[PDB]
Each structure stands twice: as C-alpha cells, then as structure tokens.
Amino acid sequence: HWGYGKHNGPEHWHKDFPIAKGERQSPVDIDTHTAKYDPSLKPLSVSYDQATSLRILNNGHAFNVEFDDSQDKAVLKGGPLDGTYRLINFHFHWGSLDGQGSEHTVDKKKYAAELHLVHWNTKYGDFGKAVQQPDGLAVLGIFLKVGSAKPGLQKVVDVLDSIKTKGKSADFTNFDPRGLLPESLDYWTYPGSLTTPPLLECVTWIVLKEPISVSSEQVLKFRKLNFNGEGEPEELMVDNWRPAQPLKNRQIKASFK
Ligand SMILES: [Hg+2]
Ligand SMILES: [Zn+2]
Predict the structure, then answer these.
(1) How many CA atoms lie within 13 A of 74 on its CB side?
(2) Known binding positions for Zn(2+)
(3) Which ligand gives the minimal distance to the CA of 94?
(4) For the site Fine-tunes the proton-transfer properties of H-64, which positions are given?
C-alpha cells in the first residue's frame, strides 16, 4: 500500500488520502523567530509513573511500543491541553544517515530521529472516537541527536532483533517511558495531523525544545529493521519520515522566551 519508496512514498499519498493536501497537515518547519511566545501557556504535566507497556511490534512502517490505556495510567495534561490524554503508544521516525530522520525541523535543521508519544483525549472514550475530533489527539514529539548513549533506550534497542520483519511482535512489559524524556519540558505547540496515513487532522502537537542524545550504536540498531515481511527481499527500514508541510493559516506558539 503506501510507504516511503519512490513509487508509494509521501508524494503519492494524496491519491488514496486526499487529506494529504489539507489545511492542518504535519510535520512543519518550526521557525523560532516567528514562533509566538505565549505567557498563558501552562507547563506540561506528564504522569507516567503508573505506565504499563504490553508489547512491541513491527507494523511495516515503524515499530510501536503499546501501553495499557484502559485506565488513566500514563497521562498527559496541562500545557495547551484541555482535559486528560492517555498514552496509547510510542514510535520513532529515523533516517539512513545521522543528518536526517526527524519529521519536524527547527529553523530547517533536521535531527537524526524523532520520538512520538501518542495520546488520546479521554472525554471521547476510545482511540477510534478521538480520531473523529479536532482535539482528539495529543502527540509529544522529542528530537534525537547522536551523542552519548541514552540508558533508558537500551531495553528497546535490545529487543529489536526479535521483531525484525513486518508483522512480528513480542511481549514488552515493565518499560518506563520516563527514561526517554529530556531534562526540560519547554515546548512549541501547533494544531496538526498524524504524519502517516490516514493523516487525520486531530492532533495538538507538543514538540519539546530540548533533544535527547542517543549513541551511534543505538541508532544503528533501528536501521537494521525491515519494511518487508519474512521471506520477502530485504528492504531496510530507514527514512520513514514525511517532509515538512505548508504551515498555511496556523501559528506556532512557544512556552518559553
Ligand atoms: Hg480529527
Ligand atoms: Zn510519528
């Protein structure tokens, strides 16, 4: 179906998902000099102490670590959000080389990868209902730069060989997402969409200013995954990111001066 190749990549998506050319598509380039500092923005509140991871799977376009969202175990609130949002999964986007991989860019600067923590608004009951609302989802975006190793990411890196090809999954319990957070919670926020089909415009994006550092060895493991399923010719899972989209009639707000 859709993918990141020249015959089914981001440029072809609009044919099956017309919303690709919508009014609030993501990602976008964050112009730090145009971003409006908003003093009314409250600090973010991330309560991940009771998080419960269930499994990790390779879905053909990335690998998702899923969480139990049947209760307010791991929630995001505060910031530009009204209401409580539950963590359902987290995934990454990465490149074939250290100079690309992130979806959002800062003053045109691309990072090695980008982590997306996906949450849905509890007032809507379940994920499927939330994606029918303009304020249904909240995605926390975190940039990854190559430098020193991130200890809290090693548990994820080690299990990757078990889910090399499309369709494979493995139990992945007791993982604490707090180990993937930077020191500061300063952020930029804007209304956007999911960066992969169906590309629904229900997302309130919260992109953290401070990136986290991962080692070259850690990011190399990501590049060993496969897009294809077992038995099929090997297509390395790299460059699974969408190019920046037109900002249009939108304003990016910053929580910091
Ligand atoms: Hg929506
Ligand atoms: Zn994503």
Answers:
(1) 23
(2) 91, 93, 116
(3) 2
(4) 4, 59, 64
- 222: which 2 tokens? 């990501």
Residue 86's identity, in one-letter code, is: R
244 three-class SS: coil
Assess contact for 87 and 117: CB atoms under 8 A. Answer: yes
Distance from the alpha carbon of residue 21 to the mean position of ligand 1, in angstroms: 15
- Both tokens of residue 59? 């879905």
Closest CA to 139 of 148, 152, 130, 129: 130
Instruction: Report which bound ligand comes closest to the CA of 202.
Output: 1
Resolution (A): 1.8
Cα 123 to ligand 2 centroid, rounded to whole Å? 23
> Of 5, 88, 100, nearest to 53 (Cα)?
88
Go through the chain and tell me how many residues it has.
257
Ligand 2 centroid distance, CA of 248 (Å): 21
Structure method: X-ray
Q: Which tokens is 4 given? A: 């990141």
- Residues annotated as catalytic (active site), given as ranges: 61
Given CATH 3.10.200.10, say whether it is the number of domain 1-257: yes
The residue behind tokens 């049947």 is 70
